Amino acid sequence: MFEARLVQGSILKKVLEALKDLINEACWDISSSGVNLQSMDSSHVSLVQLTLRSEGFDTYRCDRNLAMGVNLTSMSKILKCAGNEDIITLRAEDNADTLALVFEAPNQEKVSDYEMKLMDLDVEQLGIPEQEYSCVVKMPSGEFARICRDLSHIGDAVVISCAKDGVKFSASGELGNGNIKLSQTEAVTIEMNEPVQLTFALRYLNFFTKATPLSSTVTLSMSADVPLVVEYKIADMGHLKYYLAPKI
Amino acid sequence: MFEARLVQGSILKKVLEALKDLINEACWDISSSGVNLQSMDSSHVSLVQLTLRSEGFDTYRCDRNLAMGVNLTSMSKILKCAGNEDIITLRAEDNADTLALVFEAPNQEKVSDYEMKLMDLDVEQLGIPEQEYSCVVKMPSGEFARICRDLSHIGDAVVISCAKDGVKFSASGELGNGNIKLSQTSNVDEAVTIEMNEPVQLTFALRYLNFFTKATPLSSTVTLSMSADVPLVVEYKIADMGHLKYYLAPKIE
Amino acid sequence: MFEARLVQGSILKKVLEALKDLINEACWDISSSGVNLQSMDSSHVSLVQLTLRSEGFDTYRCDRNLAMGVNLTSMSKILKCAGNEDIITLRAEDNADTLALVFEAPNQEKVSDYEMKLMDLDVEQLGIPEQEYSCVVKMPSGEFARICRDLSHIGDAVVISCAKDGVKFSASGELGNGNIKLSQTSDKEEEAVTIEMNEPVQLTFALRYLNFFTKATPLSSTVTLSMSADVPLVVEYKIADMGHLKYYLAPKI
């Protein structure tokens, strides 16, 4: 048995919106410390890592560890049948090939109950090992999104150059080229051990920025020749972290 | 000769949005007492019945009774050329193969005239006879629409079960199942009300209920009426004018 | 060498929205007095004429007179990467095949630089000679846009009839016919309808092309229509303190 109640159910709505465009199917690892999900996209270019701590739920019971295999597209569809003000409860039995999602309306008079079929996934999960990065940029999440959106009209790749003054994003294609230059000050903050220059697929960054509604800020972490880390904090619950292999 | 000026024209915009997705062509029955329209959809699963009383109009003249045959798609397109605050007047002359719609802007300086061609339809109109129902549910129209919309992502059919505490809507398909449970509001401030002679359980096509909820902008509330083995009635009041009523045959094997 | 800074960069955003749906590529004629662009659509039905005076810019430098060939579609796409509150600067170096667009954000911490490739166009520009028109109508730009939009659901052509009382727009097609009748206003000057009639006129024009013109609507509260028998309609939007955007449309036969 597993039972997690979340009063701010919107959070879970946004989490699913943020994932289903990158991943069709993933394993939800439940345990006593909370919910963890970790998965590559189907092109093996990126990895996504989700953490929701048990203590961020309003109540949380997990008696045994569970690897629930979930169609994220299905789950997101069910979560659309939830009001943005609904109270959301997830419930699974020990054996079970189904996950129950229960939506309680603010007015108390409406309760919806969805039983979602699970699926069997063989995800022996590996991850990116923890490390310290040459460059770490903290900035408004909406600003980052607009940058990735703008440049994706110019080319399919973005070169990210981090010096000390600031950081520069540039792209190039059929219709010319563009670059966007950000300086240290809603604040923009930069922590530079050493300069770095990397090239990434904009297609994948625009998937990541679907997490924008979860957080005011976003953190980009870079070193030479290793995956970019794009991280959104989910306040008082955990984080959503995306890793993107550099282009060659 | 026929002339009706409306209490407010948006109402007629909403009526036509509410119909054109269900019916292509219908008869508008005009008389002294007002406007009546009654029609099955083309798959003969449902019936729609519209009543607009003369006394709900601002002025209303009908010297002879008319069955005006209307392309509802066309009429809805013309009504899109009307502002939501426009005053709307329908007009038909004695020898009418055309219906005139006249839109007067609030500022008085813009007047539009549209002449829509009619057609001859041989609608010998049958209807559901009046009756009392085992179950009658009154609820916010928007809540009902959201229910039908939500469940239509789960399956193509909804089982509606009415007991006394409350009413339950459920569906089932590829991706699992769902149900939605509604209770009576005792302590109102948006109320949900239930009148149960005897319990009932029926199954209906969601595709058709989602056509009906296109009437939602007409009314804050909606009334569902049920008995065993007979059409669901879904009714929106058009307050002080009349009503839009849908009937939906139950599903079987 | 050419450099024009515009604090209200939104203006330029709207100008390009207003053009790219009618013209793929055009010549920007730069000089000391400002920016002039003049071009036919590719079906040679209409002409568009843009004027932006140097004095309307916040700073403006043009050392020599220049015909820059621009993909308007490209330029509009780049201008979408500009915030609606950004400061916008255009820059062409001496002898360059590229136009630089530079966007400065209100917060000062973001600066974007886009370099657009230019192209060589052989536009020996012809224009409509200046004249006085039998009929001149000034009216709210949004009202005009709604008229063209409404009537384009009835037919592909609009007959415009100007008498003295007022002006009438009408159309006709499959689903019937429609006409819209506007009178002079005896609140504002940004809600008034004004008519100057030397002599009555009646012309017929393609609605498809009027609905391209009304993409300029966000530039101006008002629009001016100028007509005489057998000559192009002129539809004009003032760009306040800067210039104008003018569209000409050949009459239908």
Numbering used by the authors:
A (entry chain C): 1 to 185, 193 to 255
B (entry chain E): 1 to 189, 193 to 256
C (entry chain A): 1 to 186, 189 to 255
Give sentences copied directly from the paper behind this entry.
Cellular responses to replication-associated DNA damage are centred around Proliferating Cell Nuclear Antigen (PCNA), a DNA clamp that acts as a processivity factor for eukaryotic DNA polymerases. Structurally, ZRANB3 belongs to the Sucrose Non-Fermenting 2 (SNF2) family of ATPases and contains several identifiable domains and motifs, which provide specificity for a number of defined substrates. These include the amino-terminal SNF2 ATPase core, two PCNA binding motifs (the PIP box and the APIM motif), a specific type of zinc-finger (Npl4 Zinc-Finger, NZF) and the HNH nuclease domain (named after the three most conserved residues). We have previously identified ZRANB3 as a structure-specific endonuclease that plays a role in the replication stress response.
The 310 helical conformation is stabilized by a network of intramolecular hydrogen bonds; however, whereas in PIP boxes this network does not seem to necessitate conservation of the constituent residues, in the APIM motif it involves a conserved basic residue (Arg1074 in ZRANB3), whose side chain nitrogen interacts with the backbone carbonyl of Asp1071. Moreover, Ile1072, Phe1075 and Leu1076 of the APIM motif form a hydrophobic plug, analogously to the conserved hydrophobic residues of the PIP box [ILM]-x-x-F-[FY] sequence. The most notable difference is the absence of a glutamine residue otherwise conserved in canonical PIP boxes, whose side chain forms both direct and water mediated hydrogen bonds with PCNA2529. The APIM motif contains a glycine at the analogous position (Gly1069), and is therefore unable to interact with PCNA in the same manner; instead, it forms a main chain–main chain hydrogen bond with Ile255. In addition, the side chain hydroxyl group of Ser1070 forms water mediated hydrogen bonds with Ala252 and Ala208, while Ile1072 forms a main chain hydrogen bond with His44. Differences are also observed in the formation of hydrophobic interactions: Leu1076 of the tripartite hydrophobic plug in the APIM motif has a smaller side chain than the corresponding phenylalanine of the PIP box peptide, and does not intrude as deeply into the PCNA binding pocket.
